[PDB]
Automatic annotation (TrEMBL):
Domain DHFR: 2-157
InterPro entries: DHFR, DHFR-like_dom_sf, DHFR_CS, DHFR_dom
Catalytic class of the enzyme: oxidoreductase
Keyword Nucleotide-binding: yes
Name of the molecule in the record: Dihydrofolate reductase
Protein purpose: Key enzyme in folate metabolism. Catalyzes an essential reaction for de novo glycine and purine synthesis, and for DNA precursor synthesis.
Binding site for NADP(+): A8, I15, G20, R45, R46, T47, T67, R68, Q69, G95, A96, Q97, I98
Pathway: Cofactor biosynthesis; tetrahydrofolate biosynthesis; 5,6,7,8-tetrahydrofolate from 7,8-dihydrofolate: step 1/1
Keywords: NADP, Nucleotide-binding, One-carbon metabolism, Oxidoreductase
Enzyme Commission number(s) of this protein: 1.5.1.3
Taxonomic source organism: Mycobacterium ulcerans (strain Agy99)
């Protein structure tokens, strides 16, 4: 199947801190739900842990959790020991370690950029860096109901 990555980052590249996402952006949650609904969503074990309880597993999607643990069970989800096992449309939904594993297999990235100043600090989860072999285009800067500015980028591998 075609593999896409989807993530939201601060301009500095931070995607996660302290076991969660360091902003609220309802329009990004709607974007994420819309693009992933009905598809397989592949995530690292720490991202599974980070889902708020009311949203775990993510409804309407085949949830696949990647772990090195034996006998990890994730209620309502499928558990695999490698990205290759996860990939047999598929969306990789994070976090930083699973993005790095999936990027060589992906042909599409959908990125939300959040206009917040979050200097990377120890133990932050960071977004993957796309090189110039990714074609990209950007939507407009928009003001979120949360107060923050954001915009969506779409990338396709050449
Ligand atoms: N803003 C966003 O778009 C976004 C998206 C997703 C998550 N997040 C945030 O990012 C953070 C979580 O990301 P993270 O980078 O810490 O974790 P992660 O990538 O979601 O999960 C890491 C875990 O994946 C498993 N794993 C990693 N490499 C593996 C391999 N080669 N084979 C098998 N299993 C492997 C391991 O599980 P075991 O330890 O169980 O072996 C590892 O501890 C949280 O803060 C979350 O809120 C943000
Ligand atoms: C949503 C943040 C996000 N943003 C983009 N762009 N990429 C991503 N990888 C991503 O992380 C996916 C992992 C976290 O996910 C959720 C966190 C809180 C609630 C929900 C449920 C959501 C749904 O049902 O999807 C509902 F609120 F609409 C998911
Ligand atoms: Cl919270
Ligand atoms: Cl939010
Ligand atoms: Cl909320």
């Amino acid at each position: 199947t075609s593999v896409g990555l989807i993530w939201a980052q601060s301009t500095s590249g931070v995607i996660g801190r302290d076991g969660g996402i360091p902003w609220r952006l309802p329009e990004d949650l709607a974007h994420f739900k819309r693009l992933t609904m009905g598809h397989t969503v592949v995530m690292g074990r720490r991202t599974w842990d980070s889902l708020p309880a009311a949203h775990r597993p993510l409804p309407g999607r085949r949830n696949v959790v990647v772990t090195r643990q034996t006998g990890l069970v994730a209620h309502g989800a499928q558990v695999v020991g490698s990205l290759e096992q996860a990939l047999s449309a598929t969306w990789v939904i994070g976090g930083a370690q699973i993005y790095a594993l999936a990027l060589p297999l992906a042909n599409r990235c959908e990125v939300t950029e959040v206009d917040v100043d979050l200097p990377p600090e120890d133990e932050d989860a960071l977004a993957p860096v796309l090189d110039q072999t990714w074609a990209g285009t950007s939507g407009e800067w928009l003001v979120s109901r949360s107060g923050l500015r954001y915009r969506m980028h779409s990338y396709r591998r050449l």
